Design a protein around this ligand. Structure first.
Ligand SMILES: Nc1ncnc2c1ncn2[C@@H]1O[C@H](COP(=O)(O)OP(=O)(O)OP(=O)(O)O)[C@@H](O)[C@H]1O
Ligand SMILES: Nc1ncnc2c1ncn2[C@@H]1O[C@H](COP(=O)(O)OP(=O)(O)OP(=O)(O)O)[C@@H](O)[C@H]1O
Ligand SMILES: O=c1[nH]c(=O)c2nc[nH]c2[nH]1
Ligand SMILES: [Ca+2]
Ligand SMILES: [Zn+2]
Ligand SMILES: [Zn+2]
Lengths: 96, 362, 184, 145, 48
């Protein structure tokens, strides 16, 4: 069962992304769609880089979205994070 | 005449390639018959003369004939494999090397990783004139020339790939050619390439199936010297049947974790051996007679022997073959020692290896 | 960043792609530093966010102190992470990773022989195979077997392949000798 | 036929007690478990035979001197002198030894082939007892399951 | 199989509520949606 749980974790990564949980099946319509969704659209590294960018940027110089995320982060509100959605799903009707 | 050497050579090669499979089957049957003949073998009583006892009285001439026939059939199996499957492997590797040469520029834009025997070996085939010998067009050289020559440098890229721009211009210009003669052996020697034959035979030797067939070769020729080497050919049944192939590959499939589990068993047996060496030496006498002792755990090498061999196989822990600890002042320590050995070594890690193998098979 | 924003919000307009081909090199250079995430907007729409990723922060990311920690974090959250605990744990791990990458930046201060013996063995053994053609002893056998004899032909062909197998054995022996020289 | 032969010899009537397996569904499943995976089972039995043959050949060529099974010293019981009897001594009583052929073979301590004997018996214990026997067992029980 | 049935029962509770059987996936769109559906919207204790 320990082996099975490790394999379960690995294949859950392979099937779905962490940030919004949309399975690879939707992204798989376009070539390397899940891979792209992982490295640029929904990247854990990119989100952490955004967090450090917010921390290292001055309060005066924050943009609108940056200030919104910073305010929500201070108040420990995680709604700004996407939940079962992305840019591709949001604008599927126009983009595709 | 030379027409007739070429004709009969191609006829033999085509026949052997056509019948290569059934002929491997006949080789397997000959090996089985040889082993069945060896079943009735005997020793006679100082040089121990191994003499084949014969119930009917005709076993040894039949064994000689079948050994020679096994060698011949196996050699022709070599021939059939070379005629049949070798060109396919050569063509596949040629396709790969051409594609990484053109699309990726593996040897022009980049360089081989230098840890890849495949790349280091395919470095030689690039300059050969027989490049795509079997991969359709011989114009991939010109295509790579057009793609990468002007960017990196025409002269030395032409030196690397094997052409010159003189031939490229001569292609468009007028050409006169002198047709080859089958009579002239020097013409065929010039036509065949030292570097291309280099690359081809190296790839063939790298091929795994050719290595298996060469193993079959060596086992047969050594079986001629000693008839018992023919028993190794009976391992070919595992190659023959898919289920036996699955059983043999089950070991390798989980073999990495299997090696780790064997190492862990070794670690545990070492710890138990150290404990018994420090404390429980007095019980390790294995001599039935009282006059001379057989003091097994005096040397830790012999004690680790006595654990690995015969304690793991005891079936109930090392406590079975060790003498009874009743009445000793270390009685409870001995009991805990042997019970923990029975659990961790027999009940555990052995069921683990067993389950790993059977689960890989499943 | 402005060009990327325009391109992503309008992929259809061809003039924007023309500017993109005019500026491929700039975008290619700025690709590692460019950051791209998707957030839930203040107007109930998903909005992409673009930001700068520093090379030092990246290098700290590839440093192993990040790698083992993120292995552990992923392994924990995939197994025992709830719907909301997943995301709070992600934020907590982000902060912990920030601290440990600051620590890493602080602490930071500022088969060849196998291939090559195999090449030797192969060249030697194949050159020995062609040393027979260099001696040129097949023309005399040729002149003897000007006549027509399929038995002699099959024997000669079998001898040539026989010695090709012998050559294979010499190659195996040379590989074994090289292995012995390297292990000793 | 079993009944009419049981009239001649009353013990043939014991064969009719196999009819309970026909009678009950669970016993029917148990009896059909052998046939369900029986093809792979025959192949596994053949592989066990192959491995036992290889070990017998090795012991015949090298490890004959250990195969004495006579308690008294006057007359020897030289088991692996003939390979047919040695293959007997392996198939029967080495597979059933429970700890490999090393249990019933005499102790190899002090011989110049000591390490070779140890590797031989340990590999026999693994490949024959731990392996391929668990394989047949698991095949049958998994067919039943 | 007894262990598996016990785990099956537990994870069936975790996935779906007893009263109407709608899986947690629908409620999961809002935070703690299944939990809320269990303690106030569809509660066995509340029905009793
Ligand atoms: N949201 C996601 N973010 C990042 N990777 C994701 C995501 N969803 C799935 N993946 C997959 O996870 C892999 C990369 O993430 P991760 O770091 O967990 O794995 P990895 O291959 O072990 O990486 P690394 O070699 O950098 O340690 C890729 O195979 C990628 O497709
Ligand atoms: N319809 C439901 N009613 C109540 N709980 C439900 C329902 N559906 C799912 N659950 C889950 O069951 C749990 C509470 O119910 P239950 O009493 O069966 O479990 P419990 O944790 O053992 O409770 P307790 O500690 O009160 O004994 C929670 O985890 C809740 O999310
Ligand atoms: O594009 C091609 N690919 C091939 O493999 C081939 N063979 C002959 N002609 C060919 N053309
Ligand atoms: Ca401002
Ligand atoms: Zn996503
Ligand atoms: Zn409900």
């Amino acid at each position: 069962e320990l082996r099975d749980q490790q394999e379960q974790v690995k294949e859950d990564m392979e099937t779905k992304c962490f940030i919004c949980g949309i399975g690879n099946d939707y992204f798989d319509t376009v070539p390397h769609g899940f891979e792209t969704h992982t490295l640029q659209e929904h990247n854990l590294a990119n989100y952490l880089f955004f967090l450090m960018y917010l921390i290292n940027k001055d309060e005066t110089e924050h943009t609108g979205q940056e200030s919104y995320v910073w305010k929500m982060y201070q108040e420990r509100c995680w709604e700004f994070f996407p939940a079962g959605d992305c840019f591709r799903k949001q604008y599927e009707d126009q983009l595709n | 005449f030379w027409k007739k050497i070429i004709a009969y050579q191609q006829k033999l090669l085509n026949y052997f390639a056509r019948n290569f499979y059934n002929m491997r089957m006949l080789a397997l049957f000959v090996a089985f018959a040889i082993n069945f003949i060896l079943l009735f073998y005997k020793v006679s009583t100082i040089a121990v003369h191994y003499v084949l006892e014969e119930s009917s009285g005709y076993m040894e001439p039949t064994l000689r004939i079948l050994a020679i026939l096994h060698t011949v059939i196996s050699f022709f199996c070599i021939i059939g494999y070379y005629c049949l499957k070798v060109p396919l492997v050569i063509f596949k590797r040629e396709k790969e090397v051409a594609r990484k040469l053109e699309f990726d520029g593996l040897y022009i834009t980049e360089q081989p990783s230098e840890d890849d025997i495949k790349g280091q070996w395919d470095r030689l085939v690039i300059n050969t004139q027989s490049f795509p010998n079997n991969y359709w067009d011989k114009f991939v050289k010109r295509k790579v020339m057009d793609k990468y020559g002007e960017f990196y440098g025409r002269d030395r890229i032409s030196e690397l790939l094997g052409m010159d721009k003189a031939a490229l211009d001569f292609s468009d210009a007028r050409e006169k050619k002198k047709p080859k003669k089958d009579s002239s052996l020097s013409a065929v020697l010039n036509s065949i390439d030292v570097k291309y034959q280099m690359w081809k035979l190296g790839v063939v030797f790298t091929d795994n199936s050719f290595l298996y067939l060469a193993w079959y070769m060596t086992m047969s020729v050594l079986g001629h010297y000693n008839n018992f080497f023919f028993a190794a050919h009976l391992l070919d049944i595992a190659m023959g049947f898919k289920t036996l192939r699955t059983i043999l590959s089950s070991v390798t499939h989980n073999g990495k974790q299997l090696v780790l589990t064997v190492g862990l068993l070794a670690v545990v047996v070492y710890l138990y051996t150290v404990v018994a060496f420090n404390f429980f030496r007095k019980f390790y006498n294995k001599s039935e007679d009282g006059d001379t002792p057989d003091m097994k755990c005096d040397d830790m090498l012999t004690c680790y022997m006595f654990h690995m061999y015969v304690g793991v196989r005891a079936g109930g822990g090392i406590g079975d073959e060790i003498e009874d600890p009743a009445g000793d002042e270390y009685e409870i320590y001995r009991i805990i020692f042997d019970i923990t050995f029975f659990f961790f070594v027999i009940v555990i890690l052995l069921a683990i290896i067993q389950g790993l193998i059977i689960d890989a098979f499943g | 960043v402005l060009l990327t924003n325009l391109s992503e919000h309008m992929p259809n307009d061809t003039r924007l792609q023309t500017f993109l081909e005019l500026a491929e090199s700039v975008l290619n250079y700025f690709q590692p530093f460019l950051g791209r995430i998707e957030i839930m907007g203040s107007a109930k729409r998903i909005e992409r966010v673009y930001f700068e990723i520093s090379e030092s922060s990246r290098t700290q990311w590839e440093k192993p102190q990040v790698k083992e920690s993120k292995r552990q974090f992923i392994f924990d959250v995939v197994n025992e992470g709830g719907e909301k605990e997943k995301m709070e744990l992600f934020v907590n791990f982000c902060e912990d990773t920030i601290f440990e990458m600051q620590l890493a930046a602080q602490i930071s201060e500022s088969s060849i022989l196998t291939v090559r013996s195999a090449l030797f063995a192969l060249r030697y053994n194949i050159l020995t195979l062609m040393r027979m053609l260099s001696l040129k002893s097949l023309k005399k056998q040729m002149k003897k077997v000007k006549k027509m004899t399929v038995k002699d032909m099959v024997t000669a062909f079998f001898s040539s392949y026989w010695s090709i197998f012998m050559t294979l054995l010499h190659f195996v022996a040379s590989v074994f000798r090289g292995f012995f020289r390297i292990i000793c």
